[model samples]
Target: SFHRVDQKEITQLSHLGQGTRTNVYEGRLRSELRVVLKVLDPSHHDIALAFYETASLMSQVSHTHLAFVHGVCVRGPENIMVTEYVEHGPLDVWLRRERGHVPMAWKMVVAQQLASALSYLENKNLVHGNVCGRNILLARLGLAEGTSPFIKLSDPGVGLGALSREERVERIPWLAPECLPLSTAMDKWGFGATLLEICFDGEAPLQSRSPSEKEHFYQRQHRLPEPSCPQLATLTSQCLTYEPTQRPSFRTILRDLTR
Candidate 1:
């Protein structure tokens, strides 16, 4: 019963990415507003159910730093959740591709915005199941020529999409120690990795090691490779702490990130 758009109302442009049961696309809503359509596979038995749950979860949240959920297209044979189309795409892609072209101040702004979104979710008693540079979006980069670039955290829900075993292992470096067996504790660890990503110009945390080696690396090394900035390195250390109980709250992280 949330905002629903008919299939005819949207014009698909290009495929963005996909999950086990969903296909994401960049499209136009009413041929004007740029939007993303997270469409569920029609053959899946519970596809409609997923659309409702995902759309509702998305509708409940609203924040400057979080992706804006436009609504859903629930008319039969089409189960799509629509969201605002972010301009530059994922944070990881740009930071690495643009490399030296990106400004230091812009990177700091990205860190601050991500921290702000996570803290907002914390205040709402909602955990962003996935928190990483890939799930974060960069909007209007050129517009930021005169202002700060806009960053938006996305897919705040427990992801319904599936991951291959290798893909799951790849995420190990961003996950907290307790999460291996897999809390907010999880998000904090990811947030830490994401900050490292921004600092390293989009390199994944523990970039030097193989995914299979990430867990043990954390256990033995007990620290990231360490960024040049002393302040970020310090925060990364706290978040990647061996004990989940010892991690700082998102609120504390936001304050530190913006300082």
Candidate 2:
């Protein structure tokens, strides 16, 4: 339970990440097993239930490409989530720092893996609410023989199903325009952005912005930035279409990309 460990008892292994609602720390349990621990801020109590819900949903999903949720800790007036710890950080940081110059073939291989994961989620009538480079993991190569490269999806903190209409617009910048009202097609838009991040090495479409500036920028430009891959450009463009009805499904994307 969260209360079992005080700040003194839990040796802070490292700061994993920071977000509006929680601070994540990589730490070990009494059993010496490493885990990613998400500690929620008291002020963001509204998100505690949502976090638990997301954790529960993730626990139920047994896919190699999704992070495994270990347990939930609700104690000491705080909510915490524990999951398997990935030694290498987010895919965005890894691509930017280590493999920014990696060949297109490698990118395609990673994309195919991501598409397979997306297909699994789509079949389950779910979408990875966040599908950006920052939320992906490139599992250690050679850890398991004869298995595809591991690509775990993390961070469902701002999951779409729990969001209100207005909050949805305010929170999800990478979603398709028509997804403001909520649609499964929204995941396609995020997938396109993830692809661009891989190719561009973490460059956002528009940078250097205040909150107001970002809102204004979006108002003026309703489309995502173009991709560099000629073959992938069309697919990415369609993913970001303003109309949800026009966006392709994960099945369609997989078939096209594979073909």
Candidate 3:
């Protein structure tokens, strides 16, 4: 069980960044323990509710590639969550910092770990719903850069469910054409999108696409496009399969990643 941390116990070290709904900060837990804190901005209780729900759900999940939940602070203006402080920032940002320097084998390692985590989620009947380079937290930059890089999938950087049409707005890029709330299928596609980021050093076309462009992309990019890595392109093609069931499970992706 995680400790229900108090705001007083944490000293804000620096602001990491923000999403549409949440802001991230790096802080010290107690005296020497460094941790990452995510605070959800609430208006009509939607954000607060999701914050607690995420804490509750992720608290039960313990995996190497998944971020470790340290607990939450609900007594403040913004609902705050505590997690392990991954040394390297979000995958996309880190990739940008050292685009050409990122190793091919390490990219596969990143993909492998993410697949392992999401695969674990499928078995547990939980839908991450949100999977992107933004949510992928890296433990290190690279094996050559001091130590080997590690990855952990962070919580929903967007809203959790697939409720309204507007809810699809943020997820449109990676979401399957036939999107459903809390779906394993959608997460699979999101996983593929993240892979696209790793392979391209965080270049994701679908992520920032406008709705109209996304629709066009959905129709036009049905087949594989030119990826620098043929294997990555092949795996990406498989994951982007229009039919959800036609997409391979994360377990099936292991063989390709392992080689």
Candidate 4:
């Protein structure tokens, strides 16, 4: 049934991105409306299914702060998922383009939006397993149609992968130490890491280094890099604790951010 729609019918806008398991293309409909098309890599069918399920789960939740999934296409051997095109791009890229530091007021606003979205997901017992600067879109932040900054979590292809028995135990350097084991508590730890990344101009706890170096640093239980804002430092530290049970829940984190 997916093959019924001709690819020629869509106008190519631009290449949005390429990940380990997919290539995203920005395209326009016949009506000239913009849409993001994610074409899955055939080599990673399991990863594609993971992304599809994440999108499906997200679709059930109605929140303006969350990205909207438009449709899915599985025609022939092709697997594609269409979503609203976030024109402004990923959060890290946007932050870099803005020269790193954004206004505190803007940061607070974005944080609230993110908190609300996370709250919604948490209530449903779902975790955004991969929450980080690169996985979030900034254009969704309610900025003026072209001017307002926004954020949306993207790329769910890795969701829950870490929790499986066969999952690799390698630490995500930017993630909290507690998150190494892939528990719900660990997910909260990741949320804290993501919050730090957002508030601190996308600076990760770990410095830029070779993958092996990062792995070694984490293996030695090195301290996470400090957050610049003292007010947020406590939260970040608590989130990255080596013990998963010590991490705060989404509700508590949201309340603290709002307060």
Candidate 5:
């Protein structure tokens, strides 16, 4: 079982990203396998709850479009969760840094793969809790002639339940207005915002300061600003609909992308 790994066996390659509770690193395990090391900060907070929660939930699911966890290191002062390393990093970074580098067809492929992962979770009666672009990693960039890029959804079962009201408000760009309380529909709304990220090349459409302002903005406007690409705008707009129930399921969204 890959339930535990020796922290000393994993060699850190480079820094990937930092979060409030953890510091992520690009790492190599036993000199052969590239991996992501999410080191939980015990000084900042208790690592038991979040560490166990993430591992337990991640252990239950397996999908081609989902990041695979190899093991964890919880024995000493350092607490690390090891996962498969995707070379291209997060989708948010890809859209922002290399706006014109990727073709439109490839972007839709990323969306479709993400939708497939989400649809898999939906069928399992699971809520992914987070579905924004940052949590979506790109395994391949697809600039080559024949090969297509692959997308992997990360940080499953990590919810926003622990955030403060201010923290929740800070997530205005991705969170649906109705997401004060989280649900699968909330995941769909975040997916719509992610679609907007693809359409606008990582631009934030809703830059409102507060949730109230965002709600009011949506109340007045009725929809997100349409992109230049009308076809993508049509698909994304359906996701940004006001009523949560009116938004299409991930299965439906996947179908829309495929044909």
Candidate 6:
């Protein structure tokens, strides 16, 4: 249903990174330059189905907060989508490179930006199944007036767009107990988890904890990992509510941050 792409080019594109379901690379898209070339492994039928959905999902939206999908090649088994290449890399790794203490204000701005994007997606009936630091790429940005760092969400789609329930929630350490069915409410839980990464110098929530234990702990205790910044701490508290229905609206969350 869209333009066909020819993937008869180089094999194993210069490796940039991997995502929840695709291998990411640095490659050119026809006439486009410096775009993230995401290849879906052809071996899995479910993954292929999900890749197609992810591809279709890409072209449906445009926003300042999105990674900006350019085009997709769905010919034969060549399932690859091209998107703008964000230079600073994933937020978790980028945080470590920043080293000793970063400004809370900057983290707050990034949080607000992400919240704004999620707000947009919620209206469209989509959820950014994965919203961790690993999936968010940061542009190094500039000191020039009115210019600063920004967060670009990479590889967001129907988290269920291609994944089974247990498969979807398995590796993602920061999801609500009922995240398997997946919804905007579950994303609110993930947004809080992403905030934990920002506040803790990129440490994933409760590093080295067992999922089974934490699964019960979050539901039973109604608690989350500590946040270093207070406003973020407050917002995250609202977001991490155990029952999905209890969480505040993400747009309201953004408004709270901006105000």
Candidate number that wins on TM-score, 2 or 4: 2
TM-score of each candidate? 0.83, 0.83, 0.87, 0.81, 0.85, 0.86
lDDT of 3 at 70: 81
Tens digits of per-residue lDDT, candidate 1, 1-259, equal: 4577778888888999874457889999984898998877765545466457656766788898888787788657757788888988888888888776776777777788888888887888776656878889877674346877888888643242333345555566776666554267778888887778878778876667786687677556567667666768888888877778899998888778767
Stretches of candidate 2 off by over 4 Å are: 1-12, 141-149, 161-172, 178-182
Candidate with top TM-score is 3
lDDT of 6 by residue, 1-259 (tens): 2344556532335888776656788877656467787876664677666665665666677778778776666546657777778887788887777745567777778888888888989999886677788878877542235566787887663345566655544545566667544578988888888898888878876566665655556446557666867777778888877778999998789889877
Model 2 scores a TM of: 0.83
The per-prediction CA RMSD against the true structure, in angstroms, equals 3.3, 4.2, 2.7, 4.0, 3.0, 2.9
* Candidate 4 overall lDDT versus native: 0.65
> For model 5, what is the error of residue 176's alpha carbon versus the real structure, in angstroms, after optimal superposition?
2.8
Look at candidate 6 and tell me the lDDT of residue 81: 75
User: Which 10 residues in a row give candidate 2 its minimum summed lDDT?
Assistant: 1-10
Kindly list the per-residue Cα lDDT of model 5 for residues 81-131, writing each as its tens digit.
888899888887778887767678887788888889989988887777667
Q: Candidate 5: minimum summed lDDT over ten consecutive residues — where?
A: 43-52
The clash count for each model shown is 1, 0, 0, 6, 0, 0
For candidate 6, report its TM-score.
Answer: 0.86
lDDT by residue for model 4 (161-231), tens: 62442232333654555444435565666667676776767666554665566666667877576667676
Runs in model 4 lying further than 4 Å from the true structure: 1-12, 29-32, 140-148, 158-171, 174-183
What lDDT, from 0 to 1, does candidate 5 have?
0.76
lDDT of model 5 at position 258: 79
Write down the lDDT of every candidate, Cα atoms only.
0.74, 0.69, 0.75, 0.65, 0.76, 0.71
- lDDT string for model 3 (1-259, tens) is 3458877887777888986567788988885788888877764566566667777788999898888888887655777788789877788887877788887778877888888999899889888877889889878667475566788888774355514555665566666767723468878888887787777887776665576666666656454345687768878888877788888887788777887
How does model 5 score by TM-score? 0.85
What is the C-alpha lDDT profile of model 2 across 52-141, one tens digit per residue? 667767877878777877777765776777777886767777766655455666667778788878888888887667787777877753
